[PDB]
Curated annotation (Swiss-Prot):
Similarity field: Belongs to the glycosyl hydrolase 5 (cellulase A) family.
TM region(s), chain numbering: none
Name of this chain's protein: Endoglucanase
Organism: Bacillus sp. (strain KSM-635)
Interval of the full protein contained in this chain: 228 to 579 of 941
Active site: E151, E263
Length: 357
């Protein structure tokens, strides 16, 4: 569609880098021109790993027009720590993304607990070392983007949580710096680093950034809970006052770091409520105007509003199969309100939703 110039495929854009455009750092391809990635995040690979299949990745790359996909590998909550097999899906997902021309975000999905240094996350360094080692030599190694800790937060389910302040950011930085260094020894691939309060604090990262190349900081928002803002923080505003997620993004960009919206939803923070579409238009027009890449949560048929596919509803609707079949397209009524909207926004087409009767 028109205005989609920057949403380039990896075959075209090549290795990603950060360039200074108008005093701010932005994602760019090999030739230095800005590139924006738009795509979907899987739900937990231990719960909805069925989405990693040929027809689904063809549909998402071609029919939905995604130039990226995010693979959410939970470690706690019956993920990788207790069920190592889920890593097989990370490999398969990378293979399909390579084949179907999408950048792929390998996400160590820190979530419960919220401190990435917690014991259950002990395999983080070895996990990234292993995946990086396998792909170092691959001609398509530059398609991989590493996301080291999804949502640092106060969540204390299964270990310690983190505070929403400098101490919480310093904890993430302490976790991240050895892994960043090892990953830099293996390549130049972009690393996306989460930050406090469920990655709502890229501003704390801007105040104290990781000294390394090609590091971007996450922002996560749900349009039912995180209200848009047009007034940025006054110069000199201390971190204690910075609670509006949109204004925190503007702060990060104005203060020298690059941001990547690695996860957002059309519901309230939980994954339910709404959807909140007029809000989603304001947030995505903000992201798009400022060349911030985004991954929407999520590729699931679970009955929750953020889920992209129609759920089982006893009365009348069976859950959409996460494999779309040979035609490699999911029919309109097989996408939920949220999935239908997000597909239109990834594609950059007009939002013309079907009558759901």
């Amino acid at each position: 569609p028109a205005g989609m110039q920057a949403v380039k495929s990896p075959s075209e854009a090549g290795a990603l880098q950060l360039v200074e455009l108008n005093g701010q750092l932005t994602l760019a391809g090999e030739d230095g021109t800005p590139v924006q990635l738009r795509g979907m995040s899987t739900h937990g690979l231990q719960w909805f790993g069925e989405i990693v299949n040929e027809n689904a990745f063809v549909a998402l790359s071609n029919d939905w027009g995604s130039n990226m996909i995010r693979l959410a590998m939970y470690i706690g909550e019956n993920g990788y720590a207790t069920n190592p097999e889920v890593k097989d899906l990370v490999y398969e997902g990378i293979e399909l993304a390579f084949e179907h021309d999408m950048y792929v975000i390998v996400d160590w999905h820190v979530h419960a607990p919220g401190d990435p240094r917690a014991d259950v996350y002990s395999g983080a360094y070895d996990f990234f070392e292993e995946i990086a080692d396998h792909y170092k030599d691959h001609p398509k190694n530059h398609y991989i983007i590493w996301e080291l800790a999804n949502e640092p937060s106060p969540n204390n389910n299964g270990g310690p949580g983190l505070t929403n302040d400098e101490k919480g950011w310093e904890a993430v930085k302490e976790y991240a710096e050895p892994i960043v260094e090892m990953l830099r020894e293996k390549g130049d691939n972009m690393i996306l680093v989460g930050n406090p309060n469920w990655s709502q604090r890229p501003d704390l990262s801007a105040d104290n950034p990781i000294d390394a190349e090609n590091i971007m900081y996450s922002v996560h928002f749900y349009t039912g809970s995180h209200g848009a803002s047009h007034i940025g923080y006054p110069e000199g505003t201390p971190s204690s006052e910075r609670s509006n997620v949109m204004a925190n993004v503007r702060y990060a960009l104005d203060n020298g770091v690059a941001v990547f919206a690695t996860e957002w939803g059309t519901s309230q923070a939980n994954g339910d409520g709404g959807p909140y579409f007029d809000e989603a238009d304001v947030w995505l027009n903000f992201l798009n105007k400022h060349n911030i890449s985004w991954a929407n949560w999520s590729l699931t048929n679970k009955n929750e509003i953020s889920g992209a596919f129609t759920p089982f509803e006893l009365g009348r609707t069976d859950a959409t199969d996460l494999d779309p079949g040979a035609n490699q397209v999911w029919a309109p009524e097989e996408l939920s309100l949220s999935g239908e909207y997000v597909r239109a926004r990834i594609k950059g087409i007009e939002y013309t939703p079907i009558d759901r009767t």
